[PDB]
Write a protein that binds this ligand. Structure first.
Ligand SMILES: [Mg+2]
Ligand SMILES: [Zn+2]
Ligand SMILES: [Zn+2]
Ligand SMILES: [Zn+2]
Lengths: 45, 1425, 49, 59, 107, 183, 98, 49
DNA sequence: GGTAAGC
RNA sequence: CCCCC
DNA sequence: GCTTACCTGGTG
């Protein structure tokens, strides 16, 4: 067999607004998720 | 110039003494103590505090208040203050040097670890250069890890003498961030060495010891690399950006200093108080951090001292670091006043050297004129006009310093001017101004023009001047700079004026010609068919400004007087202009209206086009610049355009699709042509597909097939191309431009009307990007013209979708390269300039740099200016010895070989004259001696070389001047000629000196010119060919003398930059890729930009190393000889001949398990070991190619393993070629070990590193017995890999002729002289392969610079920039800050002899107009009254 | 005539530019250059949805 | 075969009468084009004389 | 002049500078097989006398520093057995002038 | 029209050929400084304001804004604002130094916070001139070189005159055949 | 290009469930020496198992998508030479209509 | 005979910019690349609002 | 992200 | 950025 | 023989 074509278009992905937004929303939610854990640790109630 | 009179004497900087501040000096030069982190607010009161951001160090508030000095903003340099550091701290810049100094001195007593008692040390202490000496002392002392009390005495090695006791063991110092950690010697004593500890032993280093290290007793003691008292820079260095009252943003430095301060107050508090000692170490290291991070905030040790914003804090070091840096961005280049920029537009009605300046710009830009009795009235009127009318003025500068603003001054209407006042008036018509087009790659990118104030918003320029600028009118912008002195404007007009730049010294040819409309129209105007009638003839004549007012007699008189185009264009050509040409079928009665003949500025025959009126070396332009001067020439551009342009405005010219539409039957021809080639392709396909296609030396059946295909399709594009181009009439507008030379070529006609042709990506036809197909529209395994990118249609017919895509694939190719190359091509340009900057021609004709080191003893080896050099033919060199003798030999003593009495009056009485024959015998003997010598210099016989003084033209002009009668005898004598030429040679002066060195140097410089001179003024030639008169011949000698002298270089020539730019500009145009040898591997070359880098970088690991081995004389024609030499050279391993190797369990040595090996046993037996058999089979073909036999191979294995292995083998004629091996706990696995080393590293035949050798049949030009140069081909071995050393001593080669692209390897084997010779060959070959031409002297100079140091000095930061040249100059390229620190620590002295140093200091450089001084002579000043 | 497909952030219209990347979960074989001791490499850049 | 193998690569080059040499003045010219300038201006055309062996350029 | 086959032992190589004013030169037999001075690219290098050198420096108004340099280990410097300081006159063919002479100071 | 430039019919230019509109919108906000310390949109006057711009404040209405329809030139004040840093400071906006035109639209609104927000659009007509860039759809870019009126222009017997004159030299090397076929 | 689009990202599970029903043997159950010929079935670069008659499965998949039952964006390729069947549910694939 | 698919229109291989060029199949490749980039420096009507 | 001259 | 040979 | 430390076109 011959070496893989590292430049074949079929092996390429174009990340649009959707996945790009999905990337932020995941880190942003997980940042709020751990911030909620700060409130729960500080909790005397 | 820094405002208001100073009584102090004004002087220039002659020397810069670099050093380091003693802490004592910082305190001595301080104005304020500095002690509060707080910057301002007197508690809250907005005004600066007694601590930071000064009392005292300067001012703010644009309120004078600068401490007693009390000078105010512009006038006040700031004043430094200090901060006393609570604990000493290392300076970042010197951390490494400190390590190295500690590594050289005993960490206890401060003594040097080595001394005079050590022989190696004595050798180092002898080193003159401090930098090299410290490097040596360190390399020695670093390993010394005890401070010896006693060492062996100079005489007795058994006895010892006390040196300087102590005897303490030294640590092994490692740098831990900003800390220095030692390891003395159970397990080692690890400890961090304190700053105080280091400082102390540095303070204890002997003067003699620190002077032996790079240091200076006065200017830079090593102890000063440790900081103790920090200088606080004044506000001008760290300005507080005020956002209007009670809002001010301090500089990053101001903030950093506050942190240093805060860290320091902290440490001082703990030190004084109850020091917890492990808290003290923290505040100490923090102080260290800030002090480090203030100067350099880009340390390897990651934490990057950030601003509370997340920004990283601008280190002082960061402000200086190049391009935008202080040096590069503010000193080498500046943003400047008296400048302008707009869109450039073209103008046929402007003289070559004028520049159309928009009024708005003219009214803005202002030249400052001094009120003199000559201008008093004129300037008075411009002042009255004010700043708003065109001939106007903006300001009036009084005796009393301050300037009057004419737009506001209540007195602006009044103002009675006085002598000496300056009037700042608007830029006006004829003011010399510097016009520029970026990127400024040449001297011609910037030229001086005369203003012409005009309406509309564009700078208008003459079309001819477009080419030097490399400008077009598709919205290009150009720059204008206004000179302000009567002195700088003379520099512009007398040195940089557009007409002075006509002939470029880069290419040694003119760099401006006739273009576009005028070039097209000039061909059209000058055909036989073109006649003009009175009406227009008059307007045409009236258009030439210089016209004599005389109506020329029409060519046709008869019942309709008609003038020919040629006839009237001749009016634009000045009188006394002679030019002869001869193109293809050209006779004196030119039938095609070919070539060119101009007699006394009147066209006799031929059409005028790119050849006559372009920027050709013998073109009407060149001849006019040379024969009449730049000003007459510049006038000529103007005149030719004014006439031709007018005629064209009236004739017209166009282009349409009609001009692309090639004939019906021609289209049939073109279609069957493409289909015919397509057939050949299919045939070569079916041949290849049926395994019948034959190999090709240019290997691979596949590579071979593609060659045939590619060629067939190229022959097709070009055959169809011609068919069309041939079928278009002489009326075809496209052809009419192609003919004039104005636009387009044959390719353009072929592609537009016949066939586009084959598309190429990476030098190969469109690849299978998909699996076995170029597009999904095709089948798999399709090698058809169509599938692999052949566009068969013309742009006129249109492209098919596939063709469209493949054309796009190959289109993109160029655009990628240009995008990639751009930075690499740029940085090469800079390095060349920075390396050659300081090279200039001195008043002794020598070529020297800033240090005054000789680079060339005479500029470009001849001492001539490249603008005065023209390719001339050295006749004597070629032809038969017989024809030479015919042409030159004069024998008065022989009836048949005397001079004919028809040739000279003396002819009848000269026959038999023995006394004159002795003279003609000298003449001929020298001419022969010359021919012999020329054939030594130029080995190939090449006759055409660029030399000063075009002798062809001088004789030609003498003949047209004196009306030479080629049918009358000459009044010349043989003595007149023989002795005449001899005396002329004595006056062709390049050098002057009344000593043998200079007189010999002079004789030498003129050697090649005199060869030409003697060859062109031989007695036989002068009389029988030129037919000169004494008067005529005298005029010739006279002119040669004058012209030669005009040709010598001018002391002051900035020859360095010139050469850098002459190699730089063509480099700019080379390609990264090229792939001209793609589709043929086992033939690889580095070329273009990559090879230019390999060269300039003196790259050690080059991509294509190669020996070119020439064969021993009488064996160069024998192919079989060369094959044997190939076998002797190419590195042949055992692996190279082996088919396979096997391991068997063959337990009986007497009887083999393998039935094949039966015969091998019966031999190596007929006349305790190992049962494990290593058996390897060899390839007969492999073995036979390298002239090898079983015995030779076996014996090599027998010697590589000695008595460890048992080797037996098959003899040379047995069907299978085999070698059987046996060894002498385990056994098995150590045989796999033996087979690995066996294959991988056993040399059979050949030289190592030479991995592949090929035979070539190079054609060679050599003289025949008959004398004529003849093509005598020879066999040549071309290698793959280098070992010049071994291949040279190989029998049967010509070791006098051997060569490598690896000049670095030539340098090593043959010496620096041969190294330089090879390097030139290499430099030349990169530029020239690209088609490009650079005059020798430029490349000569670069190669010389890279070579004068004894070895190869790269045009890199490591190479030239590490030389003995002045600090400031070297810091201007690459290692800016690092250079300056080293300059300080080693107390460097810059003599400001270099350009860069005078630029940084804003002083006139010793360059061109600065290469001498100007003095008033009171003696003559009196005599003139 | 407006096409949409953009965002309004603090008044300005923002385009999220399509970012080309190498696909994940794909097996790729590459020959490693002569200076390296490793002859060839089998690579997989694997990430889950 | 080994003597055939030992000989190095040749490379023919397709020639045109259209262009004429400078030095030898011969119409045995072998060109090639390349996009050296911006996409605004045209290609370059690098000509080689397959006769004398001389190289040149175009606009 | 010592012409050795393979190598001169470091023990023996120590004795080389031990007898001044006499100078010892070591050349490998293999190095001497071909005379590099005979090469196409190698021009005539001429050893200058102390007086000829004095004049060269005088005539061009030079510091020894300002002269182009030749390495001591240079194949041609070794061939002429050039000592440090010795200047060599180099006569090369020029495509510009006919002949051109350079000078190199052996350092 | 040599070396990538072109001749344009001045008559055509008069009759409206290639004329364009140019708009530029200037924005400003009343800044809030914690406790009531807020900027104001007003026509300031040298009577305690003391850091005013050089251009005319005279075009502004008492609300510190220009009425649309007004002509504006040079570095004239188009938006008037003060900063209460203490009495007043100038915060006014001059029309871009190198510009001129007519105030087209002025909008007084509110930012999400609740502060006065102002946007000011300025309109100008740009007419084809000598240095002006033009291009066809074939990478055939160029500037105007000169502009001739109808009489000086070449003419067909039909009385038709060109609007533009491009150079024959543009065509052969560029091989812009599509341009010719378009035409 | 004017008609290109980018795959949004579908769920692979209904295709995985469909495949195994259509004759795809689990990767645990595979015996290389008992069927080396067998076509390796790949979904989003995950080897799921093998198929004995890949020609039929390929047609049953293509017609199922053409009908609408498998999202038109899901890509399916059969490499006869390497004995592989690649299925992409994957988001970010540039595709065109034909 | 083996055809599986047919192209809808080959002119659909071009983008938005190169779609505006008249007869782009009658031009030298880089002319089309150059005009693609240029229409961005143009002006007409971007929206009716 | 490429080359070389440091340890 | 957005433009250039 | 590996790790570090330098660099990377021009205007606006
Ligand atoms: Mg341009
Ligand atoms: Zn002061
Ligand atoms: Zn000691
Ligand atoms: Zn030729």
């Amino acid at each position: 067999k011959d070496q893989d074509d590292r430049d074949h278009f079929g092996k390429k992905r174009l990340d649009l607004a959707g996945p790009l937004l999905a990337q932020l929303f995941k880190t942003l939610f997980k940042k709020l998720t751990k911030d909620i854990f700060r409130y729960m640790q500080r909790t005397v109630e | 110039v820094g405002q208001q009179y100073s009584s102090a004497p004004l002087r220039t900087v002659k020397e810069v003494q670099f050093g380091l501040f003693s802490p004592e000096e910082v305190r001595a030069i301080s104005v304020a103590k500095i002690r509060f982190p707080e910057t301002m607010d007197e508690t809250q009161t907005r005004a600066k505090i007694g601590g930071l951001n000064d009392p005292r160090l300067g001012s703010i508030d644009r309120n004078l208040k600068c401490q007693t000095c009390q000078e105010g903003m512009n006038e006040c340099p700031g004043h430094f203050g200090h901060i006393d550091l609570a604990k000493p701290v290392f300076h970042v810049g010197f951390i490494a040097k400190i390590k190295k100094v500690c590594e050289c001195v005993c960490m206890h007593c401060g003594k040097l670890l080595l001394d005079e008692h050590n022989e190696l040390m004595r050798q180092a202490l002898a080193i003159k250069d401090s930098k090299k000496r410290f490097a040596a002392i360190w390399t020695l002392c670093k390993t010394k890890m005890v401070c010896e009390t006693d060492v062996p005495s100079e005489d007795d090695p058994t006895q010892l003498v006390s040196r300087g006791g102590c005897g303490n063991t030294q640590p092994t110092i490692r740098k831990d961030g900003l800390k220095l950690v030692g390891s003395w010697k159970d397990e080692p004593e690890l400890r961090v060495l304190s700053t105080e500890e280091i400082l102390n032993i540095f303070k204890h280093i002997s003067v003699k010891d620190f002077t032996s290290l790079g240091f200076n007793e006065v200017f830079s003691r090593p102890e000063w690399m440790i900081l103790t008292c920090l200088p606080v820079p004044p506000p001008p260095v760290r300005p507080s950006i005020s956002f209007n009252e009670s809002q001010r943003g301090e500089d990053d430095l101001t903030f950093k200093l506050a942190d240093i301060l805060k860290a320091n107050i902290s440490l001082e508090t703990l030190e004084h108080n109850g020091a917890p000692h492990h808290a003290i170490e923290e505040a100490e290291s923090l102080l260290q951090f800030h002090v480090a991070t203030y100067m350099d905030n880009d340390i390897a040790g990651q934490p990057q001292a950030l601003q509370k914003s997340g920004r990283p804090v601008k280190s002082i070091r960061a402000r200086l670091k190049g391009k935008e840096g202080r040096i590069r961005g503010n000193l080498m280049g500046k943003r400047v006043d008296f400048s302008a920029r707009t869109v450039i537009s073209g103008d046929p009605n402007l003289e070559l050297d004028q520049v159309g300046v928009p009024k708005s710009i003219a009214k803005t830009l202002t030249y400052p004129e001094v009120v003199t009795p000559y201008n008093i009235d004129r300037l008075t009127q411009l002042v009255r006009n004010g700043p708003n009318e065109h001939p106007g003025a903006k300001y009036v500068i009084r005796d009393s310093g301050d300037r009057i603003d004419l737009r506001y001054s209540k007195r602006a209407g009044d103002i009675q001017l006085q002598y000496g006042w300056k009037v700042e008036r608007h830029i006006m018509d004829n003011d010399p101004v510097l016009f520029n087009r970026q990127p400024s790659l040449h001297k011609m990118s910037m030229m001086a023009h005369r203003v012409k104030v005009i309406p509309y918003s564009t700078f208008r320029l003459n079309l001819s001047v477009t080419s030097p600028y490399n400008a077009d009118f598709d919205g290009d912008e150009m720059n204008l700079h206004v000179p302000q002195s009567e002195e700088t404007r003379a520099e512009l007009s007398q040195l940089c004026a557009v007409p002075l730049q006509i002939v470029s010294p880069q290419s040694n040819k003119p760099c401006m010609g006739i273009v576009q409309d005028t070039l097209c129209g000039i061909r059209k105007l000058t055909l036989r068919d073109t006649f003009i009638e009175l009406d227009q003839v008059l307007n045409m004549l009236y258009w030439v400004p210089d016209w004599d007012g005389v109506i020329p007699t029409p060519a046709i008189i008869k019942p309709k007087p008609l003038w020919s185009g040629k006839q009237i264009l001749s009016v634009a050509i000045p009188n006394g202009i002679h030019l002869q040409r001869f193109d293809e079928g050209t006779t004196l009665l030119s039938p095609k209206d070919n070539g060119m003949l101009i007699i006394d500025g009147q066209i006799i025959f031929g059409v005028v086009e790119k050849k006559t009126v372009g920027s050709s070396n013998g073109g009407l332009i060149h001849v006019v610049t040379r024969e009449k001067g730049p000003q007459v020439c510049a006038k000529l551009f103007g005149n030719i355009q004014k006439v031709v342009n007018f005629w064209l405005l009236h004739n017209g010219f166009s282009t349409g699709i009609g001009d692309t539409i090639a004939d019906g039957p021609t289209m049939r021809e073109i279609t069957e042509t493409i289909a015919e080639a397509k057939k050949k392709v299919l045939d070569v396909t079916k041949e290849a597909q049926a395994n019948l296609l034959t190999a090709k030396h240019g290997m691979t059946l596949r590579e071979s097939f593609e060659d045939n295909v590619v060629r067939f399709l190229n022959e097709a594009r070009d055959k169809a191309g011609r068919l069309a181009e041939v079928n278009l009439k002489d009326l075809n507008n496209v052809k009419q431009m192609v003919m004039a030379g104005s636009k387009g070529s044959f390719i353009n006609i072929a592609q537009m009307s016949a066939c586009v042709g084959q598309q190429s990506v990476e030098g190969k036809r469109i690849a299978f990007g998909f699996v076995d197909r170029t597009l999904p529209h095709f089948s798999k395994d399709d090698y058809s013209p169509e599938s692999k990118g052949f566009v068969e249609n013309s742009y006129l017919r249109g492209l098919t979708p596939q063709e469209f895509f493949f054309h796009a694939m190959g289109g993109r190719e160029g655009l990628i390269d240009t995008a990639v190359k751009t930075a690499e091509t740029g940085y090469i340009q800079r390095r060349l300039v920075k390396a050659l900057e300081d090279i200039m021609v001195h008043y002794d004709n020598t070529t020297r740099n800033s240090l005054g080191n000789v680079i060339q003893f005479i500029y470009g080896e001849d001492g001539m200016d490249a603008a005065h050099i023209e390719k001339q033919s050295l006749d004597t060199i070629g032809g038969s010895d017989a024809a030479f003798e015919k042409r030159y030999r004069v024998d008065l003593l022989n009836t048949d070989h005397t001079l004919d009495p028809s040739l000279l009056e003396s002819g009848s009485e000269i026959l038999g004259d023995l006394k004159l024959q002795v003279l003609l015998d000298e003449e001929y003997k020298q001419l022969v001696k010359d021919r012999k010598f020329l054939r030594e210099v130029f080995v190939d016989g090449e006759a055409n070389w660029p030399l000063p003084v075009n002798i062809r033209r001088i004789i030609q002009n003498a003949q047209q001047t004196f009306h030479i009668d080629h049918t009358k005898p000459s009044d010349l004598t043989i003595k007149d000629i023989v002795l005449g030429v001899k005396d002329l040679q004595e006056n062709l002066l390049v050098l002057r000196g009344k000593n043998e060195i200079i007189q010999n140097a002079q004789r030498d410089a003129v050697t090649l010119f005199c060869c030409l001179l003697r060859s062109r003024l031989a007695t036989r030639r002068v009389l029988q060919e030129y037919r000169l008169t004494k008067q005529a011949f005298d005029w010739v000698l006279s002119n040669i003398e004058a012209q030669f002298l005009r040709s010598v270089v001018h002391p002051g020539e900035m020859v360095g930059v010139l050469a850098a730019q002459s190699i730089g500009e063509p480099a700019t145009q080379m390609t990264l890729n090229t792939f001209h040898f793609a589709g043929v591997a086992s033939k690889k070359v580095t070329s273009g930009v990559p090879r230019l880098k390999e060269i300039l970088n003196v790259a050690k690991n080059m991509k294509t190393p190669s020996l070119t081995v020439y064969l021993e004389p009488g064996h160069a024609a024998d192919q079989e000889q060369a094959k044997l030499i190939r076998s002797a050279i190419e590195h042949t391993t055992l692996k190279s001949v082996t088919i396979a190797s096997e391991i068997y369990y063959d337990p009986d040595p007497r009887s083999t398990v393998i039935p094949e090996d039966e015969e091998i046993i019966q031999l190596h037996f007929s006349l305790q070991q190992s049962p494990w058999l290593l058996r390897l089979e060899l390839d007969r073909a492999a073995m036979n190619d390298k002239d090898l036999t079983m015995g030779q191979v076996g014996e090599r294995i027998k010697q590589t393993f000695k008595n460890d292995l048992f080797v037996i083998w098959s003899e040379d004629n047995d069907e299978k070629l085999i070698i059987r091996c046996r060894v002498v706990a385990e056994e098995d696995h150590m045989l796999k070990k033996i087979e690995n080393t066996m294959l991988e590293n056993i040399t059979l035949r050949g030289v190592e590193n030479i991995e592949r050798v090929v035979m070539m049949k190079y054609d060679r030009k050599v003289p025949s017995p008959t004398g004529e140069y003849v093509k005598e081909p020879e066999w040549v071995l071309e290698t793959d890999g280098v070992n010049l050393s071994e291949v040279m001593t190989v029998p049967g080669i010509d070791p006098t002729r051997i060569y490598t692209n690896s000049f670095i390897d030539i340098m090593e084997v043959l010496g620096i002289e041969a190294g330089r010779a090879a390097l030139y060959k290499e430099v030349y070959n990169v530029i020239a392969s690209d088609g490009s031409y650079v005059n020798y002297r430029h490349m000569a100079l670069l190669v010389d610079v890279m070579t004068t140091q004894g070895g190869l000095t790269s045009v890199t930061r490591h190479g030239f920039n590490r030389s003995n040249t002045g600090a400031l100059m070297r810091c201007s390229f690459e290692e800016t800050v690092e250079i300056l620190f080293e300059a300080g620590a080693s107390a460097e002295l810059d003599d400001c002899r270099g350009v860069s140093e005078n630029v940084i200091l804003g002083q006139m450089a010793p360059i061109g107009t600065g290469a001498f001084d100007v003095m008033i002579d009171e003696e003559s000043l009196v005599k003139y009254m | 005539f407006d096409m949409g497909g953009y965002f309004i952030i603090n008044g300005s219209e923002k385009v999220l530019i399509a970012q080309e990347r190498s696909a994940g979960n794909i097996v790729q074989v590459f020959k490693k250059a002569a200076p390296s001791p490793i002859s060839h490499v089998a690579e997989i850049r694997s990430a889950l949805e | 075969q080994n003597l055939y193998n030992a000989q190095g690569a040749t490379i023919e080059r397709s020639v045109t009468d259209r262009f004429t040499c400078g030095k030898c003045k011969e119409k045995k010219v072998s060109y090639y084009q390349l996009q050296t300038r911006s996409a605004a201006a045209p290609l370059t055309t690098f000509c080689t004389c397959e006769a004398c062996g001389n190289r040149w350029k175009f606009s | 002049i010592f012409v050795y086959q393979n190598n001169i032992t470091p023990s023996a190589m120590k004795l080389v500078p031990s007898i001044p004013p006499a100078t010892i030169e070591t050349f490998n037999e293999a190095a001497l097989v071909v005379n590099i001075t005979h090469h196409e690219l190698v021009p005539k290098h001429i050893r200058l006398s102390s007086d000829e050198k004095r004049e060269l420096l005088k005539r061009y108004r030079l510091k020894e520093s300002q002269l182009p340099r030749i390495q001591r280990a240079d194949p041609v410097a070794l061939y002429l057995g050039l000592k440090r300081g010795e200047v060599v006159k180099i006569i090369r063919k020029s495509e510009t002038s006919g002949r051109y002479a350079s000078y190199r100071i052996c350092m | 029209n040599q070396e990538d430039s072109m001749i344009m019919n001045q008559s055509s230019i008069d009759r409206g050929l290639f004329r364009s509109l140019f708009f530029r919108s200037y924005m400003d906000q009343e800044k809030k400084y914690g406790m009531s310390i807020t900027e104001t949109f007003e026509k300031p006057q040298r009577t305690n304001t003391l850091r005013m711009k050089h251009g005319t404040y005279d075009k502004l209405d008492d609300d510190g804004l220009i009425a649309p329809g007004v002509r504006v030139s040079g570095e004239d004040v188009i938006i008037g604002k003060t900063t209460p840093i203490s009495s007043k400071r100038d915060a006014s906006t001059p029309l871009r130094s190198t510009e001129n035109g007519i105030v087209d639209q002025v909008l007084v609104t509110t930012n999400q916070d609740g502060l006065k927000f102002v946007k000011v659009r300025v309109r100008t007509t740009k007419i084809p001139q000598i240095g002006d860039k033009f291009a066809s759809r074939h990478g055939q870019k160029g500037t105007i070189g000169i502009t001739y009126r109808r009489e000086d222009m070449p003419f067909t017997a039909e009385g038709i005159v060109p609007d533009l004159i491009i150079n024959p030299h543009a065509i052969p090397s560029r091989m812009t055949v599509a341009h010719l076929i378009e035409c | 290009s004017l008609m290109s689009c980018i795959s949004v990202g579908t769920d692979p599970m209904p295709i995985i469930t469909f495949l195994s029903e259509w004759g795809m043997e689990p990767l645990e159950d595979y015996v290389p020496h008992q069927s080396p010929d067998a076509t390796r079935v790949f979904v989003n670069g995950v080897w799921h198992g093998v198929h004995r008659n890949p020609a039929r499965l390929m047609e049953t998949l293509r017609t199922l998508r053409r009908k609408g039952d498998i999202n038109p964006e899901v890509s399916m390729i059969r490499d006869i030479r390497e004995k592989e069947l690649k299925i992409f549910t994957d988001a970010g694939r540039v595709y065109r209509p034909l | 005979t083996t055809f599986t698919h047919c192209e809808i229109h080959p002119s659909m291989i071009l983008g938005v910019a190169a779609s505006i060029i008249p007869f782009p199949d009658h031009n030298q490749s880089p002319r089309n690349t150059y005009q693609s980039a240029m229409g961005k420096q143009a002006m007409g009507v971007f929206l009716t609002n």
